[PDB]
Design a protein around this ligand. Structure first.
Ligand SMILES: COc1cccc(OC)c1C(=O)N[C@H](C(=O)O)[C@@H]1N[C@@H](C(=O)O)C(C)(C)S1
Ligand SMILES: [Zn+2]
Ligand SMILES: [Zn+2]
Length: 241
């Protein structure tokens, strides 16, 4: 089994498939986990989501690479056997957008914050094919997110990056914080190289308030946690100001 240097370990309830791990979170929701080997350091796990919505599947975040992302699509075909309608990617970093070309080669419609698409070329990424825009309170403009089914996209403000977005899964008690949110026992906020240290705490709290009844908080580099992940992340971020 895969034992990453950074990221949750494999536990009961995880399925290894190729180089990835998949974990069912709800009857219609799975977490995908992929690993980037860094020289001298070992593997860094990154998580995203797969959601079944009737006769189609929706994806949140790519894997770190195109080949890993193709493996996610192969898991979906094996385990669910339904077409992927769209993917939402949650900011212009490799862990979230590194596999765009695999989605595009598969014919999957891709969506990201307009700002992520504008930043992608600067970050060594390929832009999504569609841009999401947001209201002044963070909620996505619905005409930009057509036919998103249960995915409720919210821009919480600058934090981990200026472009980070989050996704609630309507009809469940799950919300996805991506790299913005760290787990309740984390010692650090991760890579702050692109972060907005002034606004981070408010942005973490705004994610909590956008999805006030989400009890299972999914994030990029830890196992799903309680809402203490949100509150702890904000408390860490209070120290940055
Ligand atoms: C353009 O992106 C990259 C290029 C090369 C290597 C990378 O990660 C090792 C990445 C890249 O995607 N870096 C991200 C980032 O900088 O936020 C990752 N997310 C961080 C986080 O959630 O705190 C991390 C797990 C410490 S690294
Ligand atoms: Zn990032
Ligand atoms: Zn990350």
């Amino acid at each position: 089994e895969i034992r990453p240097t950074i990221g949750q370990q494999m536990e009961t309830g995880d399925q290894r498939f190729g180089d990835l791990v998949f974990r069912q979170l709800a009857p219609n929701v799975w977490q995908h986990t992929s690993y980037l080997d860094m020289p001298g350091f070992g593997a860094v796990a990154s998580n995203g989501l797969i959601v079944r919505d009737g006769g189609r599947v929706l994806v949140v975040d790519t894997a770190w690479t195109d080949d890993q992302t193709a493996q996610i699509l192969n898991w979906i075909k094996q385990e669910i056997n339904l077409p992927v309608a769209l993917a939402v990617v949650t900011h212009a970093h490799q862990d979230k957008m590194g596999g765009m070309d695999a989605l595009h080669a598969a014919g999957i419609a891709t969506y990201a914050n307009a700002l992520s698409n504008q930043l992608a070329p600067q970050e060594g990424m390929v832009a999504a094919q569609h841009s999401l825009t947001f209201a002044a309170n963070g909620w996505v403009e619905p005409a930009t997110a057509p036919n998103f089914g249960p995915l409720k996209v919210f821009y919480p403000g600058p934090g981990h990056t200026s472009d980070n977005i989050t996704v609630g899964i309507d009809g469940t008690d799950i919300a996805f914080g991506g790299c913005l949110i760290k787990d309740s026992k984390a010692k650090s906020l991760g890579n702050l190289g692109d972060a907005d240290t002034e606004h981070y705490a408010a942005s973490a709290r705004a994610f909590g308030a956008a999805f006030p009844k989400a009890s299972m908080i999914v994030m990029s580099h830890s196992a799903p946690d309680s809402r203490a992940a949100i509150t702890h992340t904000a408390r860490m971020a209070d120290k940055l100001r």
